Structure formats: structure tokens, C-alpha cells
Symmetry: C2
Subunit: 935 residues, 2 copies
């Protein structure tokens, strides 16, 4: 069977890997993909035979056969070298069956395909089906059934098979079970092995199999090896029509079911069947209709239901079963008010559909989606060496090899009649109601035989379907407007003649500080800009902190609807509450980035607050403070220690005492006062000319003065918090009691001077050195508690070591175990050889020296340095050279004089959650560490 159709196929312009797809004479679909650059190589074979099978003699027989092909019969398990070969090359394979097809994906570390190809070739060429082999597989199939029984996702899927026509084979149980696999046939007289013989000979031989290779070897090398071992397999010319007609006969239409799952969750499913329409996939109309249903802009279906509160989340998507029959599914979130108004929610979905009928199909919205799809296709992302093979192999059976890459990423034709046809399908006549709730338990007397899921399948008497058809009226909903920003600039701006390896202060003003960088090591239009706004009033009072959070929470919630279109564009807006300042994150294509940024600045400068929105936000904030009372001790201990470190902090109980007097008028008065004085810090990044970037900073500051009347902060109005000074000679402990968790939590912390390049290295190295032994004994052999923490702490320009442990043991006993660990580590570091110490520092050095994998990640490192005010972008490169210089003797000295129990400079503090009688008095007594000088 030697054949190779030849074509040159276009691929994402950015993508470099070259692939040739060919068809053999036997008719096996063949795809050859060559990627020499990637070290890993792979291959996949998909047979289009599902768990559902035309013979109904036993259930799970097809699933058993796919398992029988990965068992390796008796020869492959007998060879431990075969399994060792997979382990040596770090190759992990997953074998699974789906109703449409059975799929398997495997990987080899480098050029190990030849041996693997032969092993896979043997199963198809000749399966032994030995008696000893069958014994292991039947037990494995029974184990596979066990996990499926408790899987709620599978339980919904099997319920869909039950809702299938009983006469139709669609209602067969795909997973199968041990009793069906062996006990049921032996009394019947059917032989399982004889069936496996017949099925492999004809069904596997038929051309339902597709082979793809991701091997790094050249396409010509790929062609010779793949063709020789797949030429032997022949064609039995057996045609499979799947299911010609939909199983449903309208008998199970217009029925309401109540499902109680093991998990507590509430989802509503309305079932409507739909026609295949596979040939016209250019328009993809059903998904386009789903996008309109799932949209969250002006006059959205979810937006009305959000005001009612009946549906928190609405998602609409196409559902595909067999090629012959497909379905449309709408999922709505269920709320207690929504459960009472279930019928009204169903009518409201019809009202949006009525609006869609009135507007009709629209060419412009389809064109906008096509433009977005083209942009996404051109900039392909998250390419995967493993699992990509399985997806393409399934696509190959239904799609031509040349068109597989662009089939789902491009729209080429408009199909108005198809949009009308899917709209016609969405009518109450075809509607089926399925409701999931824990409360339904005890109202259901009917239980599924396969899995323990209870659905009444009761036939609604006095059906209200007629009322919904009779009362249909044009919806108040309005179709969404054209997206304001669509990326049109794909060209990357040329690098500036001046080259800077790190961010530079192109513009410095009292009003704002401006850091600028140009893209290097990456070639994408995508550019990201982070801006910090700092105002003193936010942290001045406990009332001020509470009011500031409410304003910021309200700000993002109001902007969320306006920024849904930005999410579709890929632009990213983030508004978050930080005690010192407000963090605005803008990410995405550079060309449309400024328009979104300015609109956010105007909304931030002048914000309107609704009383109803304020009340719900205030209630949610109050509930969160109540939750912390029942929160886990280890996090509670971490908060208690953090509260002591800051010069002044507000107790969580105090924060929820002083929310009693909070009012809307005080909050509205606060917004101009806070906005009136603030300072802007800038971290622009990506490919842009410096002059244009300076202009973008100028407009942002100009808008803020124009609306908020923001004026530059006076000197000394920008001071960081100072950590309390430790005694250096004493260990201090206070006790508090948890109410809900039986494990007692103790936290021990050691302050370590002030941040310095050498100081950072010493703390990091000590944490690295003790981490592996603590995991070896404290975490596992002692197993005092699941939560054991030995990691570095960096805050307020200071370094510390924190031990967060939650265990069912006395806190003092846990502290004694930590003390025993510290003395063991003293002896351990001395016992450890110098060569092992060098291996420790080298592992930390490799971890420190990580090259950026993403444009955003590269910008993030600079963002951290500036917010801390160190401004040391290259600090890691200077530090790694010092780490090699660092010696074992210095590390022993650092612990013996500072962190040791007998150390003269001993900084030890203790926080206990099951004496410091007043937190304020102890903090007032301690001096304050100065802010680190900026570099």
C-alpha cells in the first residue's frame, strides 16, 4: 500500500514546523509532521470505533477491546524491558474510548519512535488474545467502571443515553461492568474472545483509522518508516453509517426531570435536537447563535436575569452526539429565587429568541467574529507536543488533511437559512427540561439502574408549554453594538536605535515617574502597561480602609459589563484593592490599548455609585469577615503575625464593628477627597516609540487633573510602613483559641536584618538547604500535620523565615519539634559534604536564572522591583555571581550568630492559635526599621 498525495499547505505565518499529509493505497489517513527544533517526538493512531457498537450482545466489549490492544497481550507485560524502555524515555501514554472514536496518545523523549512504531504495528498486524492476558484486563476494566460510577460528569452523560430511545442502541451502557463482561456471556454461551477475534479482523481493518507522527525526523524519513509498517494492514471495505435518524421519537419530548447528584450543585438543561449541517461548516451558524445567547453586553439575555438574580451565569453551546443526530443545550445557574421562578426563566429565554427572529440574521456581527477568528488563528498560542496528536487524529476522519488546521479557525461563507433553521429548532415543542438540585431528593422515586442518580422522569401534567408559545412577545433585549476596539495593526514597531537592556526613566516629573522599555527576545505587537496610583487617606482610618474597598469593589463591578467587549478583544483590565495604592493592569494589542486605558481612567476619576449596588456589596464584605472566624488556623496564624509586623494595622473584628455606621453619603464624599491628591507610577512595556509612550503618559495625567483635580503629593506624603524592631535577646509568645478546626496552629518567625543583595542570598540559600530535610522527616516521617511550611518571607523591605504548622499536637510540643529540627539542621549542614553544598547552591542558581517564557512574565519582574522601590532590574544577575562566591563556612556562621537558640542576635517571635496581653502596647514599645534606600 504505497501512495502519497502531494500538496503545499499554508500554516500560521508565525509557526515554523513543516508538515505533509498523504493517503496510502489501503486508505489509512496519514499525516506527517516534522519539528526538528522540539526535542520531544510523538505519534498517534485513532480508530473511529466508539464504546457504542452495532452488536448489542454485551456492554463494554468494544471498550474491553481497546484495553486489550494496550495490554500488550502476555508478551509485552512479560518483557519488563518494554516498560523500562517507556520509563527510560519518560514516555507516558493515555488510552481512552469515546462514542465517536477510541483515541490514544503517546510520546518519546528523542528519536525513540522506531521501537514504539514496531510495538504499535504488532497489535494491528497480529493480536495474540492469550488466556493469561485476558485475566489481567478483565480486572482492569472492572476498576475503570468503579471510578466512572462516582463521576458526576459521566452520570449526566449516561442519563443522556437513558433519555435516548430505548429501542435505539444509543441507550446501551458504553462503560460496561465485570458482570456484563464475563458473568453474563458464560450463562448466555457467548464467547468474549471469539467476538474480539471477529471485531479486530474487520472493524479495525476498515478505513476508520488515522495515523499522525510529530517526529523531529525529516518528512522523507517519516514517510519511509510509517509507510512500510502500515502497508501490511488492508481494507475489508466495510461501510459504517453510524445512526441514520435521531433516536428520540418525540415520546420523551416536553418532559421535566429532577436529578440529585452525589455532589451539591444546581444546573438547568433544556434539550432541543438539531440537524447535522456538517457540510456548511464555513458559517458555523449554531455556535454563532450560542455566542449571542452567551453575550454579556447591552440588552443581553443574562443581563435581564442578573437584575432578577434568578440566573447568576448563562452559557449556550452546540452539543454533538452521533454524526446523524446533534442537539442544542442551554445551561442556566439556579438560585433560590430562580427555582421559584423556573417557568418565568424559560419564558425569558424564548423572549430573547423572539428578538433574534425580529432582527433576523445579521452579516456585520458574523464578519466581526470572522475578523476576531483570523487574528486568533494568525497568533497561534499554547502549542502542545502531547495531546495535539489526539485532537488532529479525530479531526482527520471528518476533515481533509490540508484543511484540518484552518477548519475551526476560519469562516468563509454566510448561511442565513441555516441560522433560520437552528432558530426554528429552538421552539417549546422540542424543549425538554432537566433540573439538578439537592433539595429534589425525597421527591424522586425513580433511580437510574447503571449509576445511583435519581430522576423522576415524571410527565408534567397540565403542561405549560402551550402558554409559552401563546404568550410569545418581542423582547426588550437589544442586539449588541459593534466592538469599539478591534486590532488592525499586526506590524511590530521597529526597535529604537538607542538600546536599553532594562527599563529607563525617559520622563521624570513631580506629578508622575515614567519607566519605559522596548520588546526584546519577543516579536509580538502585544504590549502591557501597569500604572500605580498612591493616596494617603486610604489607610488613614479603619473606616477609610473599609470605604476604599467598597468603592474599588463597586468600581470594577460597574465597569465589568462595559469591559466584556475588551475581554473578547483580548485586552485585560484588572482593578484590585491594595492598602498603599490602586493597581490598574492593562494588557493586549498595543494599537487598541490606549482607548480602553483612557475610558478606565475617566471612570476611575469620576464614579457614580447606586444605593442598591452599594447595599449588596456591603453585605458581601460583612459576610467575608464573618467567614474568617471559622477560617483555617494556619491562614489565621499567618494573618495574626502579619498584623503585628506592620506599624499600624486594623483588627478584622474592629473592621466589622465599624461597618455599622458606614453610609452611601460618606462614601460618595470620600471619592473626590481621595482622588484630589495622589501620585502616579508608570511601568510601560512592549514595542512602541519612546516619544509616543511619553505622550500616552501625558494624556493619562492630563485627564486625571481635568476630572479628579489630582495634584502632586508633597514630599514625606509617600512613606512606607516600618516593621517593629525585635528584642534580639528574647522569645515572646501569646495565645488565642480557634473554634472550628481540631488541629492546633503555632507560627514561629525569625526577623533577618534588612533587605540587601547578600542578605537576600543568605536567607534564600538557608531556606533551600533546610527544605529537602524538612520534607524528608518533619513533613513525612513525623507527619505531625499535613501543613508544614519552611519558606522565606519578604515584606516592608525586610526578610524573615516563617514556620506555619497546623497539627493535632500542643503548640509548645510543635515548637519543640521545630527547635529539634533547627539543631538537626546545624549538625546536618556540617555533616553535608562541600560538593553536596555546591550542588545545593547550583540548583538554587538554576532556579534563580530562569529566562522569561512570556512577554508578560518579563514585564512582571520589573514591576516587582519598582513597587518595592528597589528599582534593581538586574539584581538577580548580580546576585547569582555572588551565590557561587558564597561558601559553606559563612552559612554556618550566619545561623550560629543569628538564628541559633544561643545566638547573641536572636530574633525569635511566637504566635499561637489553639504573654502579649495588648498587641498595641507591645508594638508601641518596639522601635521602627527605616525604609531601604532606593537604588
Amino acid at each position: 500500500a504505497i501512495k502519497r498525495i502531494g500538496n503545499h499547505i499554508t500554516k500560521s505565518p508565525e509557526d515554523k514546523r513543516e508538515y505533509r499529509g498523504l493517503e496510502l493505497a489501503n486508505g489509512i489517513k496519514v499525516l506527517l509532521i516534522s519539528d526538528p527544533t522540539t526535542d520531544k517526538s510523538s505519534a498517534a493512531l485513532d480508530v473511529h470505533i466508539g464504546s457504542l457498537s452495532d452488536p448489542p450482545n454485551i456492554a463494554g466489549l468494544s471498550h474491553f477491546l481497546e484495553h486489550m490492544l494496550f495490554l500488550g497481550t502476555k508478551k509485552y507485560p512479560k518483557e519488563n524491558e518494554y516498560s523500562q524502555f517507556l520509563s527510560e524515555h519518560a514516555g507516558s501514554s493515555n488510552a481512552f474510548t469515546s462514542g465517536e472514536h477510541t483515541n490514544y496518545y503517546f510520546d518519546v523523549s528523542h528519536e525513540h519512535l522506531e521501537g514504539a512504531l514496531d510495538r504499535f504495528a504488532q497489535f494491528f498486524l497480529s493480536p495474540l488474545f492469550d488466556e493469561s492476558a485476558k485475566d489481567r484486563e478483565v480486572n482492569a476494566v472492572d476498576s475503570e467502571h468503579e471510578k466512572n460510577v462516582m463521576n458526576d460528569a459521566w452520570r449526566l452523560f449516561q442519563l443522556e443515553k437513558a433519555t435516548g430511545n430505548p429501542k435505539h442502541p444509543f441507550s446501551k451502557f458504553g462503560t460496561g461492568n465485570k458482570y456484563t463482561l464475563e458473568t453474563r456471556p458464560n450463562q448466555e454461551g457467548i464467547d468474549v474472545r471469539q467476538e474480539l477475534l471477529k471485531f479486530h479482523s474487520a472493524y479495525y481493518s476498515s478505513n476508520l483509522m488515522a495515523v499522525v507522527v510529530l517526529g523531529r525526523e525529516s518528512l522523507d524519513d517519516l514517510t519511509n518508516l510509517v509507510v512500510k509498517l502500515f502497508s501490511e494492514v488492508e481494507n475489508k471495505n466495510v461501510p459504517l453509517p453510524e445512526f441514520p435518524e435521531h433516536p428520540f421519537q418525540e415520546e420523551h419530548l416536553k418532559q421535566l426531570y429532577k436529578i440529585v447528584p452525589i455532589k451539591d450543585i444546581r444546573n438547568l438543561y433544556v434539550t432541543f435536537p438539531i440537524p447535522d449541517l456538517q457540510k456548511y461548516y464555513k458559517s458555523n451558524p449554531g455556535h454563532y447563535l450560542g455566542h449571542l445567547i452567551g453575550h454579556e453586553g447591552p440588552g443581553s439575555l443574562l443581563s435581564e436575569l442578573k437584575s432578577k438574580g434568578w440566573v447568576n451565569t448563562l452559557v449556550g453551546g452546540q452539543k454533538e452526539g452521533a454524526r446523524g443526530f446533534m442537539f442544542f443545550i442551554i445551561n442556566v445557574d439556579l438560585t433560590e429565587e430562580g427555582l421559584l421562578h423556573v417557568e418565568d426563566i424559560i419564558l425569558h429565554m424564548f423572549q430573547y429568541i423572539q428578538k433574534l427572529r425580529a432582527e433576523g440574521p445579521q452579516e456585520w456581527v458574523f464578519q466581526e467574529l470572522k475578523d476576531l477568528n483570523a487574528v486568533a488563528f494568525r497568533f497561534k498560542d499554547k502549542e502542545r507536543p502531547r495531546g495535539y496528536t489526539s485532537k488532529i487524529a479525530g479531526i482527520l476522519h471528518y476533515y481533509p488533511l490540508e484543511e484540518v488546521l484552518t477548519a475551526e479557525y476560519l469562516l468563509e461563507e454566510f448561511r442565513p437559512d441555516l441560522i433560520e433553521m437552528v432558530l426554528d429548532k429552538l421552539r417549546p415543542e422540542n424543549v425538554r427540561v432537566a433540573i439538578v438540585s439537592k433539595s429534589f431528593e425525597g421527591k424522586t422515586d425513580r433511580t437510574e439502574e447503571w449509576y445511583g442518580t435519581q430522576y423522576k422522569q415524571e410527565a408534567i401534567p397540565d403542561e405549560v408549554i402551550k402558554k409559552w408559545q401563546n404568550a410569545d412577545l418581542n423582547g426588550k433585549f437589544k442586539l449588541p453594538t459593534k466592538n469599539e476596539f478591534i486590532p488592525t495593526n499586526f506590524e511590530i514597531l521597529p526597535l529604537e536605535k538607542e538600546a536599553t537592556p532594562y527599563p529607563a526613566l525617559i520622563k521624570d516629573t513631580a506629578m508622575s515617574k515614567l519607566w519605559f522599555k522596548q520588546d526584546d527576545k519577543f516579536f509580538l505587537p502585544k504590549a502591557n502597561l501597569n500604572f500605580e496610583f498612591f493616596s494617603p487617606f486610604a489607610y488613614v482610618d479603619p473606616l477609610h480602609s473599609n470605604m476604599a474597598y467598597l468603592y474599588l469593589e463597586l468600581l470594577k463591578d460597574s465597569l465589568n459589563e462595559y469591559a466584556y467587549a475588551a475581554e473578547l478583544a483580548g485586552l485585560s483590565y484588572d482593578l484590585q484593592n491594595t492598602i498603599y495604592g490602586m493597581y490598574l493592569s492593562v494588557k493586549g494589542y498595543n494599537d487598541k490599548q490606549p482607548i480602553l486605558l483612557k475610558k478606565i481612567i475617566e471612570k476611575m476619576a469620576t464614579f457614580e455609585i447606586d444605593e442598591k449596588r452599594f447595599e449588596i456589596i456591603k453585605e458581601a464584605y460583612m459576610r467575608s469577615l464573618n467567614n474568617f472566624r471559622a477560617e483555617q488556623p494556619h491562614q489565621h496564624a499567618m494573618y495574626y503575625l502579619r498584623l503585628l509586623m506592620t506599624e499600624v494595622a486594623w483588627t478584622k473584628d474592629e473592621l466589622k464593628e465599624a461597618l455599622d455606621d458606614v453610609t452611601l453619603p460618606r462614601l460618595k464624599a470620600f471619592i473626590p477627597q481621595l482622588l484630589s491628591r495622589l501620585h502616579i507610577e508608570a511601568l510601560l512595556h512592549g514595542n512602541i516609540t519612546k516619544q509616543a509612550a511619553l505622550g500616552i503618559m501625558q494624556m493619562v495625567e492630563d485627564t486625571l487633573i481635568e476630572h479628579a483635580h489630582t495634584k502632586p503629593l508633597l514630599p514625606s506624603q509617600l512613606v512606607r510602613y516600618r516593621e517593629v524592631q525585635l528584642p534580639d535577646r528574647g522569645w515572646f509568645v501569646y495565645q488565642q483559641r480557634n473554634e472550628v478546626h481540631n488541629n492546633s496552629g503555632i507560627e514561629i518567625y525569625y526577623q533577618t536584618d534588612m533587605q540587601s543583595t547578600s542578605e537576600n542570598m543568605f536567607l534564600e540559600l538557608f531556606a533551600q538547604i533546610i527544605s529537602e530535610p524538612a520534607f524528608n522527616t518533619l513533613r513525612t516521617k513525623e507527619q505531625l500535620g499535613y501543613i508544614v511550611f519552611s519558606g522565606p518571607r519578604r515584606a516592608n523591605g525586610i526578610q524573615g523565615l516563617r514556620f506555619i504548622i497546623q497539627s493535632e499536637k500542643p503548640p509548645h510540643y510543635l515548637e519543640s519539634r521545630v527547635e529539634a529540627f533547627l539543631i538537626t539542621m546545624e549538625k546536618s549542614i556540617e555533616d553535608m559534604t562541600e560538593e553536596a553544598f555546591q550542588k545545593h547552591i547550583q540548583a538554587l542558581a538554576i532556579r534563580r536564572l530562569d529566562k522569561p517564557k512570556k512577554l508578560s512574565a518579563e514585564s512582571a519582574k520589573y514591576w516587582g522591583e519598582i513597587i518595592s522601590q528597589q528599582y534593581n532590574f538586574d539584581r538577580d544577575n548580580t546576585e547569582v555571581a555572588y551565590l557561587k562566591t558564597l561558601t559553606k563556612e559563612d552559612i554556618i556562621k550566619f545561623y550560629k550568630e543569628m538564628l541559633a537558640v544561643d545566638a547573641p542576635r536572636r530574633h525569635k517571635v511566637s504566635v499561637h492559635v489553639l504573654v502579649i496581653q495588648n498587641m498595641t502596647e507591645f508594638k508601641r514599645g518596639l522601635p521602627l526599621f527605616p525604609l531601604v534606600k532606593p537604588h
Copy 2:
């Protein structure tokens, strides 16, 4: 007065000399005074200021020793001050002596009468000295106005005669005329001093009889000529100057309106003292008062009116009026307003109750005279001894027991448009004044107001909008003292502890005074948060004090007092005085501050005044600037005058109104109870103040985290810091060097203070007396943010590095001096320091203020001094050397040194550590722990 001791014994000599005998055992210092009814008016007309020249001549008269200063050296031996002055009709002498040396001092004074030398050499030196005194008086703006007033009434009248005297008039014109001035002194002394009207008051303690026997025999040595007293029948003005406006140029920038009314000698009758009673009416501030009308117009900030001094036959009445730019434009209207108040007084008429209430307040207050200074008491008594016996003068002058409604009507009738003599003092009269007084060079001009305007004043006699003052409480509710509680604590304790309130209580026992003091501090975090926040707080305080001032005047008349201060931590309220209205006054003060209405015009004028203060600091002494720069660093967060000025422009009246409830929304109050108040009653007063606050502002207790104090930057050990600032206004340069040692502790406080005392006596002689580099010299310790430091502040036009090097050399010399000083000399130095620290307060207010300072510092050890003084006694010379070595020493390892350099306008260090940005340095240095 029961509080006053004795003073009720007096004798009159046959010669007519007036003698009063005082014997106070409690008084530790003896005293004696002389007086005689002769004056500048009674000087020979040709001679000028003969009596003033003669009063100096009396001291050197003694022939006992041929030394002019022999009496003065005798007074120096007894350390008793001797001063003498001549009034218009009286010559007064006063001196004091050792307690057991009263007889010896009197004998020396007696020698002057037996032989008055008045030597020729003494006269030649005296003429120059008297002329020098006259020259110093010319610069005084007030004196130049007074001299012009005496001369203007009549050249012929003796009223015009010069009082001070000058060398040319005293000696040069008589000597050329062939008159011998020394012979004139001898003849004048026999004719007037020795002849009659002498008044001697003697204070002794050994016995009343011992002084009495000696004085009668010794003061009879002079033979009386029975010479009578000079009297003037009519006022000097002949009515030629009446209804005549004057414009006078003043040396100082002062604007005043003066009107003179000649009146009869009502004071000589002393029946009712009517003129002062009328003056109180005009002075009183109340609804419908003259000051309230003037303040509303804004023409006059304040006015003062008291009966002017008058001769035997006549008296004068004058008004002093502050003038504003708008007031200067409307001066005629202001005089018309004064006339309108007089017409309202005519409509009300004389009222017995107003006189009775004033008399009742005076009588109770006369019984309650807290203290009398022994020195100068004799001099005041000598003046009134001639006209009234002490018992009669004290009772009549203080409470006016006799009442005459007719006399009150007569003085009101005496004030009239015809009686008015007009004068205006303003700085806008330069170049408009031609006439110049010869003696003081004062420039004044006659600008008679058009006769038609004078007719307008006469034809306009209508009351405006004036309301008779409401009767107030001038009587303490209980004159007696409430009994001390059965359980009593010598030092105030925390009787009541509350989340919103802190209470300390002591009842004054030894003092036995009905008067009591209550101190309250209000805490607000927002006051120090921003330069704008500090600025608005001052404006609110200034608006509050102006608004409630009219009510407060009534308490001031009763002797009750209130204080409002803008401390950075929060508002300060203090109430001191009798308990009769003290609880009532406290509630009203709280009501005004917590709920307040702001007048826009008052806010604008207050805002301008605060802005004027900020620009004023640019022109300030260089040494004062150095203290201000050091203060910024010591207080950590603080704001410069520049940023405050921009913030002051930002403040607006609506913003200020919004901030007052926010400031008053949450407060913490700490209180001190002192004086005659029952503990249970005081607890009720504490409940009342908090209850008033919660109703008015819904006050809530501050959270412990919210309530915090400031911290101080910590200098590195072995570190020297300096920064340079330039003062454009002052030619000289001021340097302040601050050496920090440690957080204040009992041992630490004693050691540094001992060092400051040890070097204080040497510093004055070694630097100011010998080096004499600059007038400004300071060697004193400074306490801020619970940290002890020593500051040396010198202002001189000398190089700063040279001056700092001299300071370092002085310290090295002081270390050598400490070794040189004997152990006994060191013990004497500690003894002086111990006495200075152990000083008992002589007033109820002083001891309570000492307790108050500890409470604001957050240290509750009231009796800290007794423990500290015991430690000071244990101190050794070696211990001070160790303290100098650890921090004060130049090369000390733990030494912390900060230098503030204010450069001169037109104008090195071994180690230079210039501070470019203060904010960067504040971030760089750590913060000292707050004291526990």
C-alpha cells in the same frame, strides 16, 4: 484682708510726716519707703525737672562716709534693691534690707536728713545721667505723646513744666545766669523735702515696737517749716484747645484715637469713685455693647477706657481706641458711636444694682487677696498714706462702700461735645504735621474738624442699638472650703478609668483656696495628617475663640479663665477659677466648639492673618531659624512654612465646615481635677462633659491602634551630621548643635542636666564674658519626643566652622575643667541644682501645671522629682566624666551628633555630612521607641 498680715499700725508725727508700721513675721525680707508731696509741677518755673534730679541726689547726701556709693555698697551687702522716682506732685523713695538689719538701714537714710551733701562732683555726673535718662525716654513712642499732652494745655500753667529734666535746663542755663545748682539743691531740700509732707512706711519682722521707737525719734530730726501742699484750682486748658482735632505722628506703627475731657476732682471726694464705674460700662463687652458694634463694623478690634490722672482741683477722662484701615476712614463715625453709647447710658440712668454687684465682687475679692510682693508694697502705701489712712484707702479704693447716684449722674453730665478735646494718632500722618515738641521731637498738627461737623456732633444725640449688660455671677457659691474627703491621696490617682475618659483627682489642702483648676485634652488623629489639615485646624480654633469671646468676658470679670490651644494631637481646653460658675462655664464652652457656625468675613480675616504669619517667618532671628529646623527632625513628620502657605490657599469655608464634625466624631479626653472640688462632684462634672459631647457630636472612643504619638529619628553611633540653610534677612549667622544621648530615664535625666548645670556657670564667663563672639549665647538641655539632647545656639557675624571649632574647644576645656574642679566644688554645684529642682509652687495653678505636663507626656509618676533629687545627690565627679566620654566626647563611639547651620546672608568642618533631601534622610534613619 485676712490673707494679708498686720499692716494696721500707723503714727502721724507733729511735723506732719506720715508713718505706717508693718510687722510681718512670715515675710523674710525687711523694707522701708519715703515719700514727699513735691513734684515737677511744683519745680521752679525756670528750672526743668529739678525734683527728679534731686531724688537721685538724696542717696549720696550722707556725710557718714566720703563715698557717694557708700549707701549703695551697704545695700549690696544686705542684697536689698533701692529705686526712687518723682511723680507729678510727689517724690517717692523705696528700699529693702536684711530681716534683722532694718534698724541699720533706717539709720543710714536718717544720715541724709542730718547732712545732705549734694556734692559738686556728684552734681556734675548727675546732670549728664538725668539728661541720658531723658534721651532714652525720647525713643519711647508712648513717652513722646505724654510729654506733648502736658505742654499743650498752657505754656503759663505749671502743667507744661518738664518732669524728667535735661542737663542744659538743669545746669547750663542756671550756671550762665550765675545761679549755683548745688546751692539750689540745698535750699530746695530744706524748703520742700525737709519742710513738710514726708511719708515714710517701714516693714519689719522682729517686732512692731522695735521699728516704732527708732522711727519717731529719728524722723523728728528735721524741723518742719509747715510748708503747704501745691494745689491747682482749675484744669490747665482755657477751652482754647476744646473742640480742636489733632493729628500726631507716632515713632511706632500704632493707630489710636484720644479725646480728653476736663472733669472735677471726684477722686478727691472718694465717695463713689464714679468715673471708673462709668468706664467699666463702656469697657464691658455684651449684647448691645460699644465694642460689639465696633467689631461688627470691623473698624475697631478693641478699646480701653479708664479715668486719667488728675491734680488736686481737676481730673481728666480719656479713651484709647485701636484703629483699622476701614476705621481710619470712618474715624468720625466711631466718635459718633461713642456719643451714642453715652446717650444710651443717659436713658438707662445711674443704677444701684450695677454698682452693688461691682461692690460685692470687690468686697469678697478684697477679703481674698492671695499675695503681696514685700518689695514695692511700702512705696505704693507711702503714696496713698498722705491722702488716706491705710484702712480707709484700702476699703474705699477696693469696694467703694459709700454710694452716690448723683456723682455718677454728674460725671455722665461732664462728658459732653463741648468738653471733648480731640487728637488722632496714625502712621499715615507723615508729612502732614508741622508743629514739633522741643523736648521729645514729637510731630503733631492742628486740623480743626469743620465747625459744621462739630455742629453735626451736637445736633446728633440719639442712642443707636445698645443693650444694658445682663447681671452675671460675680460671687463664689461657697466662700467656705468643702471638707477634705476621709480617704485622701497626696498625689492625684486614676479615680475613674473609662474607654473615652481618664480621670486624675487631688483636692488642694494646704492652700485652703476656694479656687480650683480643671484641665481637659481632646485627641484627634486627623489634625496632623496633612499640611492642609494642620492649617484648617488653626483657622477653626481662631474662629471659635473670636465667636465665644463675648460670653467669656463675663467669666474674666468674675476672675474665671478659659484657654483654647491647637495642639497637633488635638484641641486643648483648660478652666481655672472659682467653682461658682466653673461647671456652667465648662458646659457652654463645649457647646460652642462641638456645634459651631462660621462667619465668612471672620474666616477670611483669620485666614489672611495666618497667611501673614507664614510669610513673617522669612524675616526671623537666625538663631530662631536653627531651632525650627532642628524641631522638624525631632518631631519626624512635620510641614515647612512654604508647603503650609500653598495649603492655606487651598482651604475653603465649605471644606472647613465639613471637617469639623469629622474631627469631633471620635475623641479621647484626659482630665486633671485640682483645687477645692469634692471627688463625687468632680465625677459628676466628668460625666457632664462627656454627655454634652455625645449629644452634640456623638463622640466615640478611639481604638488603641488609632491612638498613637510621634517618634524621633535615631542618629548612628560615632556619627556627625550637618546641613546648611541661608537666612536672607539677617546679616549674622546662627548655629545650633544638638547632641542626643538616650531615651529619657531617671538616671539619664540627672546625668545630662548635671553636665548642663556644671558647664552653665563656666560657659557665661568663658564664652559670652571673655570670647564675646555674639550677644546670643545658650547652654541648656532640650526635651522632645521623650529624648534628652544638649543644644548650643550662638548667633554672630563670624565663620560657622570657626564658631563650631570654638564650641568643640570649649567642650575639651570643660573636660579639663571637670578634672580641675575639686570634689567639694562639684558637691556645691549639685546642691544648687537640687534646690532648683526642689522648688515648691507658691500658687495653685503652678503645681497643677506641673502635674499636667507629666500627663500629656504619658508619664504618670507625679512625684518623679523626689526620687530624681536623691539620685542627683549620689552623683560623683567620675560618673559625669563617664557620661561625657560615652556621648559628649568628640571621638565617643556611641556619640550621636546633629548640627543645624543657618548661614549669614553675605556668608572648614573636619567631617562633612551635608543633608541634600530631608525626606531621604528621614527614610534612611530609624525611629526611637515610644516611652512605656
